[PDB]
Symmetry: C3
Subunit: 270 residues, 3 copies
C-alpha cells in the first residue's frame, strides 16, 4: 500500500491547505447535490470540499477517501489504454502535483472573479462556472500528458468538451490566473502555450487548420499551435492559428483572424 | 400550507389554459420518455403535458403534483444559497408569473415555427428544439433574478448552458416571439435587453468583452450589454458588444462585429 | 419474427465484416465502460465491438442482441411519432443499410486520422472523437429521413447536438471520408450536400439564415443550404450560407462569410 501511503500524505497536505485558505475559498452553506462526470465530481470534492460536501463530512479522512476513489478510477483507465506499471507512475505523478495544482486553481478563481462583472463571489465560480470546471480537469489531464500518456488524458478532456463545449487538448501548457468566460467554442490545441493572466472568450481558437494535401496522411504532432505571453485578452470569435507567437499585453478584437506573430503591448482590431 | 394552496390555484389556472390552448399545442400521442435536468424536466411536464406525460396521467392533480416537485426543488436550492424566507418569497414570485410565462412560451413556439423552414410542427419544437428548451428555463430563472437572487438562477442557466451550449444570463430581459435557431455558441449577457420577435442564430453574442486593465478588479455589474429593439434578426457569428442600442427592424449579417449603435430599419453586412 | 430473422442476417454480415477488418480497427484491450445516450451507446457496440465490449462477450450472438435492443428502441420511437407500419418499414430500411454504413464509417475514421496530427491511432477516434460520434448517429438518422421520417430522426440528432455541440440535420447528405475536427458550433442543414473527403472545423456553418419578412410564416423546406464538392476543407468559423455550390478542391479560410458560388480548385481568404 505504498500508493495508499502517498495518498494519505497528499490528502494531509491538501487538508492543511484547505484549513489555511482565505475566507473567500470557504463556506458554511450546504449546497445542492449535483452529479457530474467522475473526474470533475471527485476533483471538485477534493479541492473545494466546502462547496461539494456535506459540512459534517469535511475531514482529512474524507479528503483521503475521495482522493483514493479518484486514484483508483484514473489508474484503472490509464491501465486499460496502456499498462499497469505506466499507470502507477502516471498516477503517482498526478498525486505529487495536486498541491501545486490547488495553488494554481486558486489563482484561476481570482482571475475569473477579477475578469467578470457578473460574478457575485468565488462560490458561484467554484460551483458552476464552466471555464473553471474545464480548468480543474485540464490541470490534472496535463500531468498525464506530461507523463507521456496520450489516450485517457484526451478521453478525460472529451468529457470536459461534452459538458462545457470547451475543447482543451491535455498537451496544452497554461499558466495561472487563467480565465475562460462563457467558453462555448473555445479550442486550445495540443501544442498551445499560454502565459499568466490569459483571458479568453467564447468561440476563441488557439489552434491550427490543415488544408488537404492530396490526400496524404498529415505529419503527427510537432509544435503547430500558438504561443501566447502574459496579460493577453482574446476577444469573442478570434481565430489564432499556427505556430505563431502573440506577445505579452496584447488585446485581440472580436472575430479576428490571426495567422502571424503579434508583438507585445498592442491592440488588434479591423 | 399557504404555498400549497397557492400551488393549487396556479395549477388550476395552468390546467384551464391547457384545456383552452389551440390544437397545435395538443397531442394524443404518447411520446418517448426522456430524462433531462430537473428544472427543464418539470417545466416541460407543467407547460406542455401532452408532450411529456403519459396521456392517462394528464389531469389538474398531476399538474399540481409536478408543480409541487418543482417548487420544493427550487425552494431548497434558493434556501441553500440564500435563506428560507427569501426562498419562500422568490418561489411565490415564480408561481405568480407561471401563467404569463405559459402565454409567452406559446408566442416563442409560434416564432420558432414561423422562422424555421425545417420545423414540421410545434410538437417537434416543444419536444427537442434546444433554443426552446433554453427559453423555458430562462423565463423562470429570470423571475428569480427579478426577485434579487444571484446564485441559484445562474446555476439553473448553467444547466441550460451544458445541455444546449446556449448561454443566457438570468438577468437578460427578453420579450415574446423569441427564437434561437441552432443556438450553439449564443451568449446573452446579464444586462442585455431584447424586444419582441427577435431571431438569433448560432454563435451570436449580445454581450461584452473586457480588455485587461492592470490588473485591477473590474467594476461589478452596471448596464454593459446591448439593447435590441423589435423584429431584429441576428446572423450566424455576429458579435454585438457593449452598452449599445440596436433599433427595430434591423438585420445583422454573418460574422459581423458590432460595437456601436445601429439605427432602425437597416441591414448590416460587409 | 420476420424482422428478427432479418436482424440475424444483418448481424451475421456485420460480424463477418468485423472478422475481416484490418488490425487498426481491432483491439484486445478492455476499455473503460461508458454510458452515453441510447442510439450512440448501441451503435458503438455494434460497429466497433472491440472498443465498447467486453472481449469475452464479442460474438455474432451478442452483436445480434445489441442490434435487437437498438431496433426495438428506434421502432418504438418512430411508432410514437408516426405509426407501427411506417416504423417497421423505416427500421427495415436502417437494417438493410447497416453494412454499407459500417463501410462508410471506416472511411470516416481513415479521414479523421489522416486529417489530425493529434490523433495517436484509430482507437482514440473510435472511443472519444466527437466528430466521429456525431457521424455514427448521423448516418443512421439519415436513413430514417430517407424513409420520409421527419420527427424522431431530428430528436436523435438533437441528442448528438447536446452531447457534442455539433448540429447536423438528418436530411443532410454526406459522402465518406468525412471528418469534423473539434466540432463545437458546426451546423449542417437539412438540404446540405457534402461530397467525399470533406474536412470541417469548429464553428463552421453549411446552412442558411432567414431575415424576417413581416412577419409571415416562412416557406417550408426546399433546397436552401450549400452543395459542397469533393476534397473541400472549411476553416474555423467559416459561414457558408444559402443554396450555393462550392466546387471540388476548395479551401475556405477562418471566419469567411460565403454567400455565392465558389469554383473548384481555389483558396478563399481575405
Amino acid at each position: 500500500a505504498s500508493m495508499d501511503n502517498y495518498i494519505y500524505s497528499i490528502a494531509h497536505q491538501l487538508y492543511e491547505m484547505y484549513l489555511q485558505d482565505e475566507d473567500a475559498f470557504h463556506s458554511k452553506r450546504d449546497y445542492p447535490h449535483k452529479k457530474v462526470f467522475t473526474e470533475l465530481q471527485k476533483l471538485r470534492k477534493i479541492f473545494f470540499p466546502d462547496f461539494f460536501m456535506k459540512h459534517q463530512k469535511i475531514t482529512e479522512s474524507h479528503i483521503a477517501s475521495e482522493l483514493t476513489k479518484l486514484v483508483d478510477y484514473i489508474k484503472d483507465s490509464v491501465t486499460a489504454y496502456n499498462d499497469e506499471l505506466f499507470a502507477h507512475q502516471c498516477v503517482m505523478a498526478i498525486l505529487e502535483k495536486l498541491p501545486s495544482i490547488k495553488r494554481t486553481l486558486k489563482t484561476d478563481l481570482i482571475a475569473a472573479y477579477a475578469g467578470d462583472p457578473a460574478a457575485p463571489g468565488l462560490s458561484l465560480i467554484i460551483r458552476c462556472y464552466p471555464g473553471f470546471q474545464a480548468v480543474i480537469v485540464y490541470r490534472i489531464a496535463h500531468v498525464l500528458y506530461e507523463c507521456g500518456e496520450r489516450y485517457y488524458c484526451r478521453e478525460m478532456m472529451e468529457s470536459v468538451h461534452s459538458y462545457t463545449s470547451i475543447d482543451i487538448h491535455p498537451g496544452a501548457s497554461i499558466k495561472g490566473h487563467f480565465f475562460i468566460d462563457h467558453g462555448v467554442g473555445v479550442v486550445i490545441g495540443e501544442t498551445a502555450i499560454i502565459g499568466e493572466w490569459c483571458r479568453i472568450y467564447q468561440s476563441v481558437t488557439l489552434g491550427a487548420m490543415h488544408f488537404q494535401e492530396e490526400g496524404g496522411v498529415i505529419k503527427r504532432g510537432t509544435k503547430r499551435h500558438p504561443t501566447v505571453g502574459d496579460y493577453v485578452t482574446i476577444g469573442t470569435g478570434a481565430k489564432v492559428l499556427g505556430n505563431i507567437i502573440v506577445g505579452s499585453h496584447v488585446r485581440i478584437g472580436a472575430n479576428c483572424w490571426i495567422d502571424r506573430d503579434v508583438d507585445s503591448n498592442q491592440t488588434v482590431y479591423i
